[PDB]
Amino acid sequence: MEFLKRSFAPLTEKQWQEIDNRAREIFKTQLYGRKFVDVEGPYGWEYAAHPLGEVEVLSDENEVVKWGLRKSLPLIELRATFTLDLWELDNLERGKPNVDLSSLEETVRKVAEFEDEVIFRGCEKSGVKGLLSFEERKIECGSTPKDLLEAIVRALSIFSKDGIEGPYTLVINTDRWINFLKEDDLEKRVEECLRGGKIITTPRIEDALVVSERGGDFKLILGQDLSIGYEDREKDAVRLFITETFTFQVVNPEALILLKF
Amino acid sequence: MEFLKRSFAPLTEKQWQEIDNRAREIFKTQLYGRKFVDVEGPYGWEYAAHPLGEVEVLSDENEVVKWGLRKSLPLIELRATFTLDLWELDNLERGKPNVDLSSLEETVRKVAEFEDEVIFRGCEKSGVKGLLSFEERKIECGSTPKDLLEAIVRALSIFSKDGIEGPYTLVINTDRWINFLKEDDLEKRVEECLRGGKIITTPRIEDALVVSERGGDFKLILGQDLSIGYEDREKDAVRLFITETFTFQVVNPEALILLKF
Amino acid sequence: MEFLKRSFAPLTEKQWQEIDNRAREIFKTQLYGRKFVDVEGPYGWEYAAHPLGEVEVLSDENEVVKWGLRKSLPLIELRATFTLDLWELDNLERGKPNVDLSSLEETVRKVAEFEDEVIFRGCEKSGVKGLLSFEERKIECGSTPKDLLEAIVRALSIFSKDGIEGPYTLVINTDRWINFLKEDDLEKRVEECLRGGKIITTPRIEDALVVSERGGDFKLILGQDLSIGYEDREKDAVRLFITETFTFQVVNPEALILLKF
Ligand SMILES: Cc1cc2nc3c(=O)[nH]c(=O)nc-3n(C[C@H](O)[C@H](O)[C@H](O)CO)c2cc1C
Ligand SMILES: Cc1cc2nc3c(=O)[nH]c(=O)nc-3n(C[C@H](O)[C@H](O)[C@H](O)CO)c2cc1C
Ligand SMILES: Cc1cc2nc3c(=O)[nH]c(=O)nc-3n(C[C@H](O)[C@H](O)[C@H](O)CO)c2cc1C
């Protein structure tokens, strides 16, 4: 809302709409992590920590009054700035349909990459642990297209043993998917051996993983969703920024399996 | 509520009421800090941290996406246990009006002392800073009863210069108050030079301080107010506990002055 | 109103309110002159001069048509500028309760001192004459606490002789008041010998004076009361200013007496 000083920027309503639409379009396809995780609704710009429901005991064993500190996860706040050209933006009022927004597009891609890196690999200073860090959930087979089907069947067996149900999803690297596709018609067979679930191809990881989408196993906590605001003006250009505040945690590590090729 | 397993203790409703009343009576007089600070209403047993409204920047200066962590105060949780005797408690049903509760009284005093120590001197591991730590708000005069009135007048002058108003309160040590009282009739003169405010005598500190009670300068944040619950049973006795979770902060250090005798 | 360009500053409504409240609190206690003088309501930003009701004759005595110029008091306009930091102000939106406003506080104190200097000592270029300049209203006694009561009684006698009535007020220096307070219990006796009036202690003067508060003897004429506005922005900070326009005059010099210790 008001903390994004959007009413003090020398832009009209149509120019603001153009910027918003381009950013939204790129985010919707480049945020790969949000395709299979839960999103806990925005809490506000003031939210600072998320409880973990635990106490760390700081007193000795011989005291009468024993005390400790409660534990939580601190939220991460990011900010990335870029510049736009005022004359080029003003051509939009004359009626140009294709204005130049290359700086905005480049910054949006970098922000999305940062967030996906946090989800998949974690941040040691914040204390989050990523999906690929769970090395006790890893199974191994070969690189032949038949080995992929064997691995999927074994993964579903392990899920049933642990009691996990629901739709299943395969998240795989694009280069590996193309190599598998060349050898044979993997699709329509992968889905059948995965009981009608989706396939998601990403460049973020270099192998595959299988997840259950019943709900409540991977949480992305948001304080303020991605927003665009105003900073200052530099003699012919406008400086704007993209901001967000979030954190991530894995509740049930039993709904995830890592395939190693 | 239910996390205090009070329905599983071998006690009747009258015995629970007797225990509650004795504890409440002692707390009301032994909690000295709560006589002049604000109390922010209970937030619940799940509250874990209180925001500070700040960001600590963890990235280098040459990055494109710059990030940081938001800052907060973690809550302190305490627990103190004691034992009561079942036969002695059962005499209450036969009609004894004065049952023995010495263990309960001793534990209650220790808990109150712990909380007041945190308020007046702070805890370095939690990150709270106490009232007596502000050494830039200290003024000095002598030990004569006239010097007390001079110090109070100067303190009110400093408050006016900073813009602080409202009722004023003098918090002083009991031994020093008695020594002042011996020499002359300090009261009715202290109040006049303090514009009709209160005097509070405590054994917690060894000098005096003057505070303004307009509101919103010293906050005590509570998650769960002081409560009594049940733990187990030991062959003839019942083990019970006292619990609480809280934190403290000083918003405006300009509403406080420390007198050094 | 609109001449204070407050709608062009990169601040939100909450930040404007915070600045206004701090300035108002400091002014209310640091404007000592306004505690015992009349205030003639604001006339507007365009008011320029206040009539004196007199004509100065500029022609010679042998002319047929004789003319002159009417006399008035020109208003004094002041402006003081300060700078605030934008990032520190933006922490208020994250939820910080104690933001840093040291520049604002320092400037407010200097403005109040300027106005009180004009009231008590006058400005020779504007043509105002201050309270302490009336040397024919001065009486003299000693520095003993008994001499203060004798002086107050004599002052009230002089007021009655001139016909002045109404509540009476004693305005005295803080250091002298403290020295008097040490020797004996001056208060409750000063009020009795002053027929139930107030005592005001200020650091502006170095002696005492006694005034009558019946009304209409000392006037402070305002065109525009103290206000805060916006000037410009310097790369990370905001430049703001405090402005006012006023003048002062003493109608009846017989309602004032100067005590010299
Ligand atoms: C015909 C004409 C149209 C212009 N239109 C714009 C405009 O829409 N926005 C702008 O920033 N500068 C514009 N400029 C440039 C502007 O006068 C000046 O160079 C400013 O410093 C921005 O370059 C225009 C210049 C000319 C000659
Ligand atoms: C007449 C009598 C009354 C007793 N009443 C109680 C009682 O109210 N509560 C209790 O815990 N034990 C009571 N006891 C003791 C109980 O029988 C036994 O010693 C238990 O192990 C508790 O001490 C009582 C014993 C006697 C002889
Ligand atoms: C996480 C983060 C938050 C920031 N927030 C603000 C802000 O609220 N206001 C501000 O003026 N500058 C802020 N800055 C600094 C801003 O990017 C840049 O330094 C501007 O030139 C102001 O210092 C922030 C920088 C970071 C890394």
Characterization of this structure:
Chains A, B, C: GO terms for molecular function: peptidase activity. Chains A, B, C: It is an enzyme of class 3 (hydrolase). Chains A, B, C: InterPro entries: ENCAP, Encapsulin_nc. Chain A starts with 12 loop residues before the first helix and ends with a strand. In chain A, 30% of the residues lie in helices and 32% in strands. Chain A has helices spanning 13-30, 86-94, 102-121, 145-162, 174-183, 190-193, and strands spanning 38-40, 49-57, 66-74, 76-85, 138-140, 168-173, 199-202, 208-212, 218-233, 237-250, 256-260. In chain A, helix 1 (13-30) packs parallel to helix 3. Chain A folds into two domains: 1-131 and 213-250, no CATH class; 132-212 and 251-261, no CATH class. With 261 residues, the first copy, chain A, is of the alpha/beta class. Chain A has a five-stranded mixed sheet with strand order 5-11-8-6-7. In chain A, a hairpin with a 3-residue loop joins strand 9 (218-233) and strand 10. Chain A is built from six helices and eleven strands. The first copy, chain A, is flat. Chains in contact: A-B, A-C, B-C. The A-B interface holds A 46-49, 51-53, 55, 58, 64-72, 74-80, 107, 110-111, 114, 125-126, 245 and B 46-49, 51-53, 55, 58, 64-72, 74-80, 107, 110-111, 114, 125-126, 245. Strand 3 (66-74) of chain A pairs antiparallel with strand 4 (76-85) of chain B. The complex binds riboflavin (3 copies). One riboflavin (RBF) binds at residues 86-87, 90, 236 of chain B. Residues 86-87, 90, 236 of chain B line the site of one riboflavin.
